[PDB]
Amino acid sequence: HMPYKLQESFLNTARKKRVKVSVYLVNGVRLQGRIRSFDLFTILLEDGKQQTLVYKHAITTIVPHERLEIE
Amino acid sequence: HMPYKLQESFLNTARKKRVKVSVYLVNGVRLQGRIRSFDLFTILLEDGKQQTLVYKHAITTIVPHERLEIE
Amino acid sequence: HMPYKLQESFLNTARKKRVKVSVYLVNGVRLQGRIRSFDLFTILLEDGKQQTLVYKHAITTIVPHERLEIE
Amino acid sequence: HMPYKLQESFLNTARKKRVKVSVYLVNGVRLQGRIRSFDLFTILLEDGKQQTLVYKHAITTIVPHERLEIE
Amino acid sequence: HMPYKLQESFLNTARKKRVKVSVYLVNGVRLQGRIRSFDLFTILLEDGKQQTLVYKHAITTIVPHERLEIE
Amino acid sequence: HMPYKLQESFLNTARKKRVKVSVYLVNGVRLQGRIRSFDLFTILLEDGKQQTLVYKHAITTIVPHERLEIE
C-alpha cells in the first residue's frame, strides 16, 4: 500500500518514449516539444533545435500527444 | 486526536469510486474527468482516452460530481 | 513564549462550531460554506449537499460569518 | 553574526503595539486592521468587530500606519 | 566547489552599502527604497520615513540603482 | 539510476559558457542577459552594466540563445 511515484513515472515514460507533449503554463502559454530531461523542479523541453528549461511551478498541465502506458 | 489525512482520503475515494470530478485551475480553466492516479504533487485526470497530468499547485478547487463518503 | 497554532485553532473552531465562512481565492472567486474538515494543505467546504476540496495555496482570506472565540 | 528574525519581530511588534496596518494582496486588494495574532503561515486581522484570516502566501506587502521600532 | 550564497550576499551588500533598489512585484507594482533588513522570507524596505515589509514570494526582480560588488 | 541535476547543470553551463539567455516571467515580462551567478532560489542576470536579481519562483522558462551541451 505504498504511493506510486506518479509524476516521475509520467515524466520518465514520456521522456523514454520520446512522446511529444503540450505543456500549459499558469499564464495561458502552451509549449510543445519532447521532454529531454527533468529533475525535481524543472523540465527540459526540446523542439527540433530549441531548448527550453521550464519551471514546474509555472506549469498547470501536461498533455501527452500519445497515450502513455505509464511505467 | 490525530489529524485525519483529508486530501489523500478525498483523492483516493474519488479514484477508487471512479467519480467524475471538476478540477478548477488558478487561471479559471475547468477540467473534467476521473482521477486515475495521484501523488504528493500531481493528479492524473482521464477523460475517455485523454490523459492530463495536473500540478496541484495550479488547482484551486476539486468538486466531485457525486457525493463522496470519504474513506 | 511559544507560538500559538493560529491557523489550526481558527480552522478547528470554525469547524467545531459549524460557523459559515467566506473563502476568497487568489482569482477573486468567493466560496461559502462550512468547514467540514481540513488538513495541512486543504479545506473541505460543504454547502448543503455540495462538497468542495479547496487548496489552501489558492486562498487569500477566510472570513467567518460569526465571531470566533478561537479555542 | 546570526540572522535577526525580521518577519517575526515586525509582526510581533505591530501586534503588541496594536498598530494599524495595510496588508496588500497579490490580486490588488488592500486590507486594513490590527494584527491580532499570527503564526508561520497566517495572520489574523481584526477591524472593529470583523476577523479575517489572511494567508501569508497571498500577501505582497504590509505597511504599518505608525513607524515600528522593531523589537 | 561549494555554491556561493548569492541571494544573501546580494541583499546584505545592498543593505550594508545603503544602495537604493527597485523591487518589482508579480502584479507589476514597483517599490523603491533601501533594504534596511531581510530574513529568509521577507525584506524590509525603507523610503525616507515609510517602512514596508515585502514578502519575497511576491517579488519578481530586484534592480540596484548602483552596481553592487557583491561581498 | 540516479537523477541527474538538470537545473544546476543547465544554469552552470549557461553561466560558464557566458551564453545569453531569455528569462520569461509569470507576468509576461522577458528579461535578457547572461547568468552571472545563481543559487537555490535566485539568478543574477547581467546585461552590459545592469545587474538584476531574479527570483526563480517568478520564472516560467529560460531559453538559451545558443544550444547548451549540458555539462
Residue numbers in the entry:
A (entry chain A), B (entry chain A), C (entry chain A), D (entry chain A), E (entry chain A), F (entry chain A): 3 to 73
Paste lines from the article.
The host factor Hfq, as the bacterial branch of the Sm family, is an RNA-binding protein involved in the post-transcriptional regulation of mRNA expression and turnover. Hfq facilitates pairing between small regulatory RNAs (sRNAs) and their corresponding mRNA targets by binding both RNAs and bringing them into close proximity. Hfq homologs self-assemble into homo-hexameric rings with at least two distinct surfaces that bind RNA. An Hfq homolog has been identified in the phylogenetically deep-branching thermophile Aquifex aeolicus (Aae), but little is known about the structure and function of Hfq from basal bacterial lineages such as the Aquificae.
Upon co-crystallization with U6 RNA, a second, distinct Aae Hfq crystal form was discovered. These crystals could be indexed in space group P6, with unit-cell parameters a = b = 66.19, c = 34.21 Å. The complex crystallized in 0.1 M sodium cacodylate, 5%(w/v) PEG 8000, 40%(v/v) MPD, and the denaturant compound Gnd was found to be an effective additive. The crystal structure of the Aae Hfq·U6 RNA complex was refined to 1.50 Å resolution; we emphasize that the initial solution of this structure was achieved independently of the apo P1 form, via molecular replacement, using P. aeruginosa Hfq as a search model. During refinement of this structure, two nucleotides of the U6 RNA molecule, including the flanking 5′ and 3′ phosphates (the latter coming from the third U), were readily discernible in mF o − DF c difference electron-density maps. Rather than being bound at the proximal site, the uridine residues of U6 occupied a cleft formed between the N-terminal α-helix and strand β2, in a position located roughly near the outer (‘lateral’) rim of the Aae Hfq toroid. The Aae Hfq·U6 structure reveals a lateral RNA-binding pocket that accommodates two uridine nucleotides. The N-terminal α-helix primarily contacts the phosphodiester and ribose groups, and the β2 strand interacts mostly with the uracil bases. Two side chains in the N-terminal α-helix of Aae Hfq, Asn11 and Arg14, contact the phosphodiester groups, and another cationic residue (Lys15) is 3.6 Å from the phosphodiester group linking the two uridines. Backbone and side-chain atoms from strand β2 hydrogen-bond to the bases, ensuring uridine specificity. RNA binding at the lateral site is composite in nature, involving not just residues of strand β2 and helix α1 of one Hfq subunit, but also the N-terminal tail of an adjacent subunit in the ring.
